[PDB]
Design a binder for this molecule. Structure first.
Ligand code: SF4
Ligand code: SF4
Ligand code: FES
Ligand code: CL
Ligand code: FE
Ligand code: FE
Ligand code: MG
Ligand code: MG
Ligand code: MG
Lengths: 626, 625
């Protein structure tokens, strides 16, 4: 069908879209159509609901009516406040994510987290020493962990001048942020200050609002997300390269299928552990299943892929379709990007929809709350619920539509450096020689406005063909994986220089660097290259892109990339076009503030042209001649 | 004109609206008319812009379309999320306010804040001891201040199970919050968690969202605001009863008039100090002025009234009209509730519009940024700018319209207990005897939807006539003051029981308890009475009301009052009526959960009836006539 083929590039999506239609199940694409046309003011950003003197709408009329809100605020202020709160929502998601990792490490240090441990003591000691813990190399591991917990929690307080991990950024970048008033000080503090600035009659200057939006996003990339990544590696292991598989075919008709969905590995790692206990496996065998099969969705799926090689069922717009296979016996959710439509779709089948976080409550879900002290017991109960649901699966409604395809995952900065021999020198040498022109992180989401994964995959293919290595995270991981680009043999799809480097190292031309919080790994890598070369991040031949973004988190990631010196492309515009001044600041003005800017471009080939053009210019800034 | 008369009850407002009309100057009321009718979905709360799969609107269509957002969220979730973020914005305003006081007190302790001091050393030692500082009674004052700073900052961290001042709440109330998951833990943490919960695909249960809204607001009332109030008393003095005046007539043709606008006394106190320096006074006299006349607007005006008796020129909807007098030589702003239209109106005159906070930037303003290390120097500089502007005032456009009305301010809890002889016993005995039937805090704003101060004044008058003492904060202060309700002789306006107690104590029937952060004083008073009587705040004959509210801050105050057990009336509905379930929770469901609920009622006489009815029911459960 042409309408169904227009919604996604993938056969597995098409098959489940057909099954959903036949069964009368409404999907995210159906609801997107209902919501089109959108409200013009909402789309432009020229609407405000921040007090009950309003709500207000801003028009552009020759007679001057409705030019200002009731309080006097103009389109520039209203649009900038709205965008600031949008950014703050994304930073807040990453803040709570990182905070939960601190709380879990603390519980381990206290001896109050059955089934959790310090999996990577070497990294604990290295990170602790980096951040100033005394005698981190030799003191008892739990004492070192307790001191690292204190440092991390202090970044969630209000007494710092600069976040702890900010020391990774080059001195020139730190000095610029300091002069601009952009230095992130406290992970929660910047969010609170954003919410204050956007209250009526506080910050009424669009430039000031956007500068604080950058500071808020920086407190995510260098704070909430970076703490989340580094502590996740400490608690659950530092990723190393491993093979796995992707697509809806990772579900198995003969197994109990448990889909983990959401974000935090504190839950999904303990779900996986529960499925390996002998009595739990025996219960599944008694129910007639051959195995218990955990498969991943979205970022928590990325986490289990990076650390445990667990196959990934799908990304954002696959989530409803994964239930439509009829073979999902449970979805185990925590928080973020979990569409509430999944509760209703699960109810069309036998699938248990289980929530685990006090923050991720869904009306009608089965709530089994997880905390470090009870996770081992509670995750066992959740797996038993999934086995019970399996006994009620209707065989006649099962359609697992595809066979999975192979992928390589696990490219932490530690794994990349190990592949290079311990230092970044061979990578720098390849860039200087012109074999690799530059690097682009392709990050972020799906969005029903764009045929699913069409731009994600086309941009990836375009960049590697141009000898630009791609670093993939988030829901782009699934797109690149299903396209066959996450394997070493995909070097045949790269240009001659990138293909040669990739074959020499035995790595794909697209490196999976993890979940959305793991975009902090991209910041760390950029800072390392810049510090090694004695330059700013804004001097490096790098870029970032989210061709199909949707979320507040993706906007926060794009903003912290830009504010750190990385040109960042977005496939779709934020709701800001109602202010020409805010739009011009985002697309042009920021170049002269932070050394990078946003780009908005829905044609992925043109986006590749624009990203390549920045890389060409940065190579010239570095004096390269190759 | 007839339209002008319909916009306010006050002569000074009418005179300035007539003047603005004659001069072609538009006001908040003109822009409110342009924005009516409002977008129906925005007004109902059934619109969401939290991701670019949207924006979404929830409609009731015969074809069943648009019942859900693109992510699947229904009207209950969308409305509850919108209300949660609204509350979070209010809590955040009070969070940063309190944080600035911590930073200033720390700068004093470090010796890096010229012109700032510990003005109330005894209160510093008392608060420090209450919160656990060792030897707070005997150590050098600045050492004790440094330890109090650390405790307050820990409440802005992520390691507490409960905020430090929560210990004031009665045990039964703390036990209830703990079982509901409402205990506030960190002032910034609850705001951040609210923004996380309201991201797409996080909290999708309207009950959970409203429970966290209560927790976020409680982290304001017992955290951001309470720290702000108590540290302000430490740095600037504990308010005591004193005389002052209110209305546009506090401006003086023969003086350099400096309006202080916004919220934080760390700036307005230092502006006031600068105007008192001899050389600055001489510069004003050299310029032709008789003196320098500081006058307050909004909450920073309330702060200067409470601690220094500085006259208050007006509340929220008077702010544009104060510039229209033509006599404002400077307006000195920090943050919150400062309408950006004031920059444009100031530009119609000689008035300088000066911003002082890195958070309160206004395109076109003169920015003179204030911090503890430079406040004394910068505030002197700002006053000199006002004196210079005075030399260019156009006397043809000066019209200061009224005679100022006398008020009494300064009713901190410390002052109230002192008037009672040191304990709450005479106040409890007046309640038991039925002379004072109950207490209502009338708090919050103006709103162009309601004839300015009409409901604030009517509700205050109705309550005192029913022997219900009124505690006034925020922009209500100006309304009660202009109505002649803030003086001891106003006992003649109250019922016989309240009048007799007021005359016995020498106090007005309406007690000015301060700025909007000073609603924390009302929480402290309720907690003291509840603990004294061995009951919950939800057992006390109390209520709260914002008849003319507008701001996110006012909604956060209302929510923390409800969550603390205080029945709370609002004159206008929040943007929640698109969800019957969220509305029913706010108006009814919370009653069984936290012991109090919101009420929405635009008729202030009916609002008086409803607040009195709650007071009567609670008196009965205490065993009182
Ligand atoms: S803050 Fe200003 S623009 Fe926004 S709703 Fe209130 S009056 Fe309208
Ligand atoms: S969060 Fe859901 S309801 Fe809100 S804009 Fe996004 S898709 Fe629409
Ligand atoms: S829904 Fe109200 S302006 Fe868009
Ligand atoms: Cl620091
Ligand atoms: Fe993501
Ligand atoms: Fe106020
Ligand atoms: Mg713990
Ligand atoms: Mg300081
Ligand atoms: Mg709970």
């Amino acid at each position: 069908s042409k309408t169904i083929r227009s919604r996604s590039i993938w056969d597995d999506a098409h098959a489940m879209l057909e099954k959903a239609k036949a069964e009368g199940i409404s999907t995210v694409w159906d609801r997107a159509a209902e919501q089109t046309p959108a409200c013009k003011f909402c789309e432009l950003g020229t609407t405000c609901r921040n007090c009950i003197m309003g709500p207000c709408r801003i028009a552009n009329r020759k007679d001057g009516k409705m030019r200002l809100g009731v309080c006097g605020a103009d389109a520039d202020v209203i649009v900038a406040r709205n965008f600031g709160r949008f950014i703050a929502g994304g930073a807040a998601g990453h803040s709570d994510h990182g905070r939960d990792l601190i709380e879990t490490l603390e519980a381990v240090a206290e001896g109050k987290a059955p089934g959790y441990t310090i999996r990577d003591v070497a990294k604990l000691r290295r990170i602790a020493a980096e951040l100033g813990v005394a005698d981190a190399a030799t003191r008892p591991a739990h004492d070192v962990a307790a001191d690292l917990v204190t440092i991390c929690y202090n970044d969630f307080g209000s007494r710092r001048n600069a976040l702890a991990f900010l020391a990774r950024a080059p001195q020139v970048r730190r000095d610029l942020w300091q002069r601009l008033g952009m230095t992130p000080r406290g992970v929660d503090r910047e969010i609170a200050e954003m919410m204050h600035r956007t209250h009526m009659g506080c910050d009424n200057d669009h430039t000031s609002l956007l500068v604080h939006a950058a500071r808020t996003a920086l407190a995510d990339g260098w704070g909430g997300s970076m703490i989340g990544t580094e502590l996740s590696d400490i608690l659950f292991g530092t990723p190393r390269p491993r093979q796995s598989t992707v697509n809806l075919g990772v579900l198995r008709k003969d197994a109990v299928n448990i889909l983990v969905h959401g974000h935090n590995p504190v839950v999904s790692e303990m779900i996986l552990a529960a499925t390996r206990e002998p009595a739990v496996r025996q219960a599944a065998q008694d129910a007639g299943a051959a195995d218990i099969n955990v498969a991943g969705l979205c970022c928590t799926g990325n986490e289990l892929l990076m650390r445990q090689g667990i196959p990934m069922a799908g990304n954002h717009l696959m989530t409803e379709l994964a239930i439509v296979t009829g073979a999902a016996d449970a979805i185990v959710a925590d928080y973020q990007c979990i569409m509430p439509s999944l509760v209703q779709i699960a109810a069309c089948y036998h699938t248990r929809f289980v929530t685990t976080s006090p923050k991720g409550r869904f009306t009608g879900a089965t709530h089994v709350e997880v905390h470090p002290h009870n996770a081992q017991e509670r995750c066992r109960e959740i797996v038993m619920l999934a086995i019970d649901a399996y006994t009620r699966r209707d065989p006649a409604r099962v359609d697992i539509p595809s066979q999975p395809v192979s992928i390589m995952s696990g490219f932490s900065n530690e794994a990349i450096l190990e592949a290079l021999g311990g230092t970044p020198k061979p990578l720098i040498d390849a860039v200087v020689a012109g074999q690799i022109r530059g690097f682009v992180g392709i990050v972020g989401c799906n969005n029903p406005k764009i045929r699913q994964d069409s731009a994600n995959v086309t941009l990836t293919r375009e960049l590697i063909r141009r000898d630009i290595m791609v670093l993939a995270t988030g829901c782009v991981t699934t797109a690149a994986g299903k396209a066959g680009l996450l394997v070493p043999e995909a070097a045949s799809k790269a240009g001659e220089g990138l293909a040669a480097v990739c074959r020499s190292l035995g790595v794909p031309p697209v490196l999976h660097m993890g979940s959305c919080v793991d975009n902090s790994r991209i910041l760390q890598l950029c800072a390392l290259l810049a510090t090694t070369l004695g330059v700013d991040i804004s001097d490096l031949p790098v870029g970032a892109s989210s061709p199909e973004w949707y979320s507040e988190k993706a906007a926060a990631i794009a903003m912290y990339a830009v504010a750190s010196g990385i040109p960042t492309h977005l496939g779709l515009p934020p709701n800001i076009l109602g202010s020409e001044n805010v739009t011009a600041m985002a697309l042009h003005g920021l170049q002269d503030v932070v050394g990078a800017a946003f780009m908005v471009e829905p044609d992925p080939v043109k986006a590749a042209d624009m990203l390549e053009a920045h890389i060409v210019a940065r190579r010239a800034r570095l004096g390269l001649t190759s």
